[PDB]
Design a protein around this ligand. Structure first.
Ligand SMILES: CCCCCCCCCCCCCCCCCC(=O)OC[C@H](COP(=O)([O-])OC[C@H](O)COP(=O)([O-])OC[C@H](COC(=O)CCCCCCCCCCCCCCCCC)OC(=O)CCCCCCCCCCCCCCCCC)OC(=O)CCCCCCCCCCCCCCCCC
Ligand SMILES: CCCCCCCCCCCCCCCCCC(=O)OC[C@H](COP(=O)([O-])OC[C@H](O)COP(=O)([O-])OC[C@H](COC(=O)CCCCCCCCCCCCCCCCC)OC(=O)CCCCCCCCCCCCCCCCC)OC(=O)CCCCCCCCCCCCCCCCC
Ligand SMILES: CCCCCCCCCCCCCCCCCC(=O)OC[C@H](COP(=O)([O-])OCC[N+](C)(C)C)OC(=O)CCCCCCCCCCCCCCCCC
Ligand SMILES: CCCCCCCCCCCCCCCCCC(=O)OC[C@H](COP(=O)(O)OCCN)OC(=O)CCCCCCCCCCCCCCCCC
Lengths: 459, 57
């Protein structure tokens, strides 16, 4: 994995030794080269994972998350270079250093063979994200946002640490490859009940679980654009990755420990999607849509069938691309009208038609239009939850109504109707902005041609 | 015919010829506990290092 870790670290002298006019160009270029390099992780086998060393491995779960992570860094640099144009040069380099450091922590979060090293990289991701939100977020509430993001995580993750160390004392190892063969069944007891909660609640916070989700519509809203891109696209998926690894050790107790959380997710995706119908802040609407989409990934991981894991990893990759694009579109309107109020700037298709086409494609992927990988993940989770219980289709199908309703309402409010008369600073779309939208949307649509690389380890 | 001892003579440590045996255990002590085994053998390196969670050295 060290052929990816070392160039990601070499981005640090690359950004700190660059000429002052070259720090976006150089980091964008070489992060795109690292992202091109990331496709060598697609040496996956039908039986074995790609096991590099004692410290690092990559199966078909971690590989698309790695490719998406390494792809998101150039797009974050493109998204962030405009609103940091007037910034001090050293603070600009510190911002890029926090993004590079976050990429470095993420790529060895997903490839960590041993679970306590997964824990340390998983929690190490908090510090650059907290710094990016509280230092380069725009408003006052970022400070409060930085507290919620910090303290819902750690209150969930410090019982995980203890739990993992307990497994270290019980199994003798936290190697996931060893734990594939030495896993013992976890019977019904109170000790194993709180073992289950300590193993699961940190990832439940990261997803987020409904009812634990309150950090997200502050953290993703108050963040700068690169912060929101990495929070929605990658850091939510640390929870899903960690659940898919940790539920190996939690059988068969999961078969009744999942029942409350499944309810919290199945009703929660009804709630948060409904919340999106009455959001006045566009970026808050995109955040609540992320909570609603990750509720399906929670249900799919908890019912733990092959179809549900395939749907959940497809939905994680698809939601990463779609939610990152939606935050970038909302930012492209924020960088013109300087307000996140969705009803403010209307009729934007009359003024910005190609950006309206990007809004259309991102809305269509948000509502899971076939054959997008959004629909592939959505549909496969719906198949597996119908097999779990046939009544879930009600809460599934009603969700797909509301998901359509808030996706097009967002599209109707901002793009359609009459333009606002008094707003006259709607600049034509920059090449950087359309480029950012296309670098989200074109890989997302090309993955429909060959979705087997985003279907995870039990494709 | 008795000569008074000089200064220093009665404080001398003398030797005594006795027929009684030397007390082999005058403190009436019981058997002492056996000591712990000492360290012996060549010191080999630690197998696969520290084994602290994920460190290979
Ligand atoms: C590996 C090689 C692959 C080669 C094939 C390519 C495969 C797909 C890749 C992605 C393609 C998207 C690109 C175009 C859309 C984005 C840009 C845009 O809007 O430009 C408008 C512009 C033309 O418009 P304009 O008049 O100048 O200005 C626009 C106006 O402002 C106003 O605009 P507007 O609203 O009037 O027009 C927008 C219109 C709006 O129309 C819609 O939104 C309606 C679409 C939905 C309903 C109809 C389709 C339903 C599903 C059926 C199709 C899929 C299955 C078909 C198979 C049979 C059944 C199974 O969209 C279109 O007409 C686009 C046609 C294709 C739509 C694809 C589906 C998007 C819907 C959402 C997701 C659905 C699931 C995913 C499907 C993925 C399939 C691969 O287009 C361009 O200039 C195109 C530029 C070059 C594009 C290159 C595409 C490939 C890039 C990949 C590079 C790497 C590989 C190399 C391949 C290169 C091939 C040349
Ligand atoms: C014939 C005579 C002459 C022979 C000459 C032979 C050599 C020729 C080439 C000369 C250079 C050799 C370099 C040493 C060998 C490679 C060591 C290595 O990569 O270990 C892989 C190590 C374990 O991977 P592996 O695949 O199992 O083992 C491969 C080898 O067998 C590794 O071998 P191993 O199994 O024996 O490794 C032992 C053990 C293997 O490791 C373990 O057992 C696992 C535990 C590792 C520590 C995890 C800590 C987690 C919490 C802290 C996270 C830190 C934050 C991230 C960094 C922030 C940015 C600074 O390492 C340690 O315990 C040392 C601790 C980690 C330091 C690694 C060496 C760094 C030297 C240069 C430092 C420059 C700054 C680096 C960034 C600072 C943080 C390290 O990788 C990691 O843990 C991931 C992090 C990567 C480490 C740094 C990469 C070194 C090169 C960086 C150059 C670019 C610097 C850019 C500018 C400065 C930064 C902004
Ligand atoms: C984000 C907010 C919510 C976070 C929730 C986090 C998880 C909730 C449950 C945590 C329980 C505590 C850690 C359990 C680790 C399990 C390890 C283990 O081996 O357990 C079996 C062990 C069993 O002991 P043993 O394994 O040594 O015994 C040998 C085995 N038998 C039983 C057969 C003899 O469990 C315990 O020792 C106690 C477990 C329960 C602990 C109760 C105290 C903590 C209560 C919950 C606090 C949660 C956070 C509070 C803060 C909220 C925010 C401010
Ligand atoms: C608000 C924000 C949104 C929510 C975020 C997440 C919060 C909830 C997290 C915990 C969810 C509830 C706890 C898990 C329930 C799993 C099944 C279970 O325990 O059933 C209830 C139990 C049934 O009893 P029984 O199955 O016999 O248990 C004995 C086992 N040897 O019933 C009983 O034994 C009676 C109850 C005993 C007290 C249990 C208290 C500890 C568990 C809750 C914490």
């Amino acid at each position: 994995m060290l052929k990816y870790i070392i160039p990601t670290m070499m981005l640090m002298p690359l950004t700190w030794l660059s000429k002052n006019s070259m720090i976006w160009i150089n980091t964008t270029l070489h992060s795109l080269l690292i992202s091109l390099t990331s496709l060598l992780l697609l040496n996956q086998f039908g039986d074995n994972s790609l096991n590099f060393s004692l410290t690092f491995f990559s199966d078909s779960l971690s590989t698309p998350l790695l490719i998406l992570t390494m792809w998101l860094l150039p797009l974050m640099l493109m998204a962030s270079q405009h609103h940091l144009s007037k910034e001090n040069l050293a603070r600009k380099k510190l911002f890029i250093s926090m993004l590079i450091l976050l990429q470095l922590f993420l790529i060895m979060t997903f490839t960590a063979t041993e679970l306590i090293f997964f824990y340390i990289m998983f929690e190490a991701t908090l510090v650059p994200t907290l710094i990016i939100i509280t230092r380069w977020g725009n408003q006052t509430e970022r400070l409060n946002a930085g507290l919620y993001f910090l303290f819902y995580t750690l209150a969930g993750s410090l019982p995980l640490l203890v739990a993992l160390i307990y497994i270290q004392n019980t199994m003798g190892s936290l190697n996931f490859l060893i734990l594939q063969y030495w896993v013992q069944p976890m019977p019904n007891s109170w000790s194993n009940t709180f073992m289950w909660l300590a193993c699961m609640m940190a990832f439940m916070v990261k997803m987020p679980l409904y009812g634990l989700h309150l950090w997200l519509p502050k953290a993703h809203v108050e963040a700068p654009i690169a912060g929101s891109m990495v929070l929605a696209a990658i850091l939510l998926k640390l929870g899903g990755y960690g659940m898919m690894r940790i539920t190996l050790l939690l059988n068969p107790i999961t078969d009744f420990m999942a029942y409350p959380f499944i309810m919290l997710s199945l009703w929660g995706m009804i709630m948060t999607s409904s919340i999106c119908l009455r959001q006045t802040d566009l970026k808050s609407l995109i955040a609540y849509s992320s909570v609603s989409h990750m509720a399906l990934v929670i249900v799919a991981i908890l019912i733990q069938t092959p179809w549900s894991y395939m749907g959940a990893t497809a939905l994680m990759i698809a939601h990463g691309l779609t939610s990152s694009m939606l935050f970038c579109l909302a930012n492209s309107n924020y960088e013109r009208v300087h307000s996140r109020t969705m009803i403010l700037a209307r009729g934007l298709q009359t003024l910005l038609p190609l950006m309206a086409a990007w809004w259309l494609l991102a809305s269509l992927t948000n509502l899971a239009l076939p054959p997008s990988i959004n629909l592939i993940g959505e549909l496969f989770v719906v198949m597996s939850t119908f097999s779990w219980s046939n009544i879930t289709i009600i809460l599934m199908g009603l969700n797909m109504v509301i998901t359509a309703l808030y996706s097009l309402y967002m599209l109707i409010t901002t793009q359609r109707g009459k333009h606002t008369h008094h707003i006259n600073n709607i600049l034509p779309s920059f090449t950087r902005e359309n480029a950012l939208m296309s670098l989200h949307m074109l890989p997302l649509l090309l993955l429909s041609l060959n979705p087997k690389i985003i279907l995870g380890p039990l494709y | 015919g008795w000569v008074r001892p000089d200064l220093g003579e009665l404080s001398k440590v003398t030797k005594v010829k006795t027929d009684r045996p030397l007390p082999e255990n005058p403190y009436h002590s019981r058997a002492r506990p056996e000591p712990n085994p000492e360290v012996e053998g060549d010191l080999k390196p630690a197998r696969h290092g520290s084994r602290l969670f994920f460190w290979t050295m």
